[PDB]
Amino acid sequence: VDRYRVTRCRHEVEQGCAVLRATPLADMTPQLLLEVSQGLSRNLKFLTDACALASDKSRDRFSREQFKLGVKCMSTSASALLACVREVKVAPSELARSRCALFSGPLVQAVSALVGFATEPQF
């Protein structure tokens, strides 16, 4: 895989999660919330695409399965977060905004675990 660009993905997911923690409820407009979701989905797509290719090289059967489980953990984390984001759009509250921070950790960690695996010194 390409060390530089999987790292840039991970940086962009952390950046987008940071937007959801940094931005007060008053400034969480439909448009700000949409740019963040689109930036997250963009970076998840690339990372899933970057990992499919790496699965294709490795002869090892554990690796191929770990990419599959790593990507699925990433995609289920993403869905839990994107539902909180949608929800703070249609039902603004300090609590729904807190909920976004709460469901960021799982996504940031799922991405960090996938990218750390992908840059083991044999890809």
Q: Which residues contact its own copies (rule: CB under 8 A)?
A: 62, 65-66, 69-70, 72-73, 76-77, 79-80, 83-84, 87, 91, 95, 99, 102-103, 105-106, 108-110, 112-113, 116-117, 120
Of 108, 11, 17, 5, whose CA–CA distance to 51 is shortest?
A: 5
Q: Least CB distance from residue 97 to its own copies, whole Å? A: 13
Nearer to its own copies, 19 or 101 (CB): 101
CB contact set of 67 (below 8 Å; sequence gap of 6+)? 51, 52, 54, 55, 114, 117, 118
Q: Output the six-digit token pair for 47.
A: 């990372």
Q: Least CB distance from residue 121 to its own copies, whole Å? A: 8
